[PDB]
Amino acid sequence: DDNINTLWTGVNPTEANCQMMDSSESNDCKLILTLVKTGALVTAFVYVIGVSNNFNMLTTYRNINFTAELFFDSAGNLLTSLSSLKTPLNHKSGQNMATGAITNAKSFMPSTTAYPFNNNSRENYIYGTCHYTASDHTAFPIDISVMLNQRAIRADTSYCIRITWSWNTGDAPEGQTSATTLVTSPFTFYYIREDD
């Protein structure tokens, strides 16, 4: 069964499943996250679809960054209370999430052996790029940094994935006319996965 090789958020959820900004009253966006086991690695594919106004209007600032923090327990279960993503992940079931248990969730996690915790003498950072398309159809470039693991906030935080989208320009992607909706193009990164 190939569907269990995916651990994902589902494609275009009915409602916003992610609270990117602390200032928001509830989930302010749709986080689309797909994790695929591909040999010794995880293929990670992620992007964002703006939902709440204050989030979407971030396009109007010249200097912006927002982070999705995803925290997992010892079994590879998403800790919804601590994480930016507020609905747990599941296997592929069409364009949707399956509803049953997760098979070998742990082997979707970033290797603690390759990406350790609280080790000043090693690094866990992954850097990439993605884009936003403005109303004027110009490709606005978005920086993406990825930090794996690192310090664990809670006693049960056994694995970490943090994704920061940032940008810096003399000009803002968008005006105050608004009537614009923020969406990042997809970013794909790769990491080594933990065993069961």
Add this chain to the structure above:
Amino acid sequence: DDNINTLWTGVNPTEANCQMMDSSESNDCKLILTLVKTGALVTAFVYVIGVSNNFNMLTTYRNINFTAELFFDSAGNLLTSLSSLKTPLNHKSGQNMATGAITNAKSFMPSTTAYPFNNNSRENYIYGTCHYTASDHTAFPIDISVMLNQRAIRADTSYCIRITWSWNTGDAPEGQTSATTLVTSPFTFYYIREDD
């Protein structure tokens, strides 16, 4: 059988399988394309090998862009008449194309759930970069755009993939005298795929 997880053009076809330029009267290049299923995603691997003289000589201009348009039917069979690629895809058979029927061709296609159709409703694409190597061995950078399912053109056009290669420079990558075959380095992008 792993061979059915790939849908491609085959490696290095005898002669040009793609008519990239509107001005060409026939196939003017070899479009090398690999679509590999990787769980809920498709890994897409693409580059071009110039054949016709007029096509190879694009290296001599300061402002150049070319697009391969791929249209697919409801079963996911390439609509060759409408497409730049004039030869259908089939599974991996060694370094070449297999000759039988295609297994689950639709599950290679870009998801209409993730990528619905824009018929004047919206506007969008996905961005990357690749390079050309000049006779002086210097890496000339080429921009790549990818548009999924933006617009359906004929009644049987169930899926769209458009890929545009462009560059803009004060100098042309090759001189009039230093003119050789146009070849791109491979570009990889990823999309969420439709189900069977």
Add this chain to the structure above:
Amino acid sequence: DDNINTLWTGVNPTEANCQMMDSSESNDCKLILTLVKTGALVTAFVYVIGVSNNFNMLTTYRNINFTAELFFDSAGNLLTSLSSLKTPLNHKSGQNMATGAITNAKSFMPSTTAYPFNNNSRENYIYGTCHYTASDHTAFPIDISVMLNQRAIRADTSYCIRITWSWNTGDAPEGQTSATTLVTSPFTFYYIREDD
């Protein structure tokens, strides 16, 4: 068995497995390399973790380049005497290398059909980017070149893979004092895989 689809160095070997610099008297770094079969392609995942002082002190210079040269025989076995990597690859066994024989090693190799030997205006180099993280956590960008096949050196050198990391900047990545071990973020590239 999914483990045989992976061919790697293992995670964080106890001792340096790679001699990057010719000036080094023994292995001066840890080469982390993972090759995963992905249909008709191989997903190649590579980065380095510095070990020797001479190698770690590379962080203090403004213009640096180093290359890992990998040569394989007709059976797809790494030729250690010739290669920068001095320890053979094996399949996944947890966070480590398998110890037995290698299953279908040749199919992890770069296609001679796609990437021929010393053939003019044919096949191509691969260019990419990755990063080094300085003490202030600022991302220093590293250019990567990848060369497939191309020139063989010894009579049993049936396959070739070269990886060049280079950089050129107005400032050195680290200060003289704040310098620490040199570690690259992972670079992921793709090639068409030779068959069995």
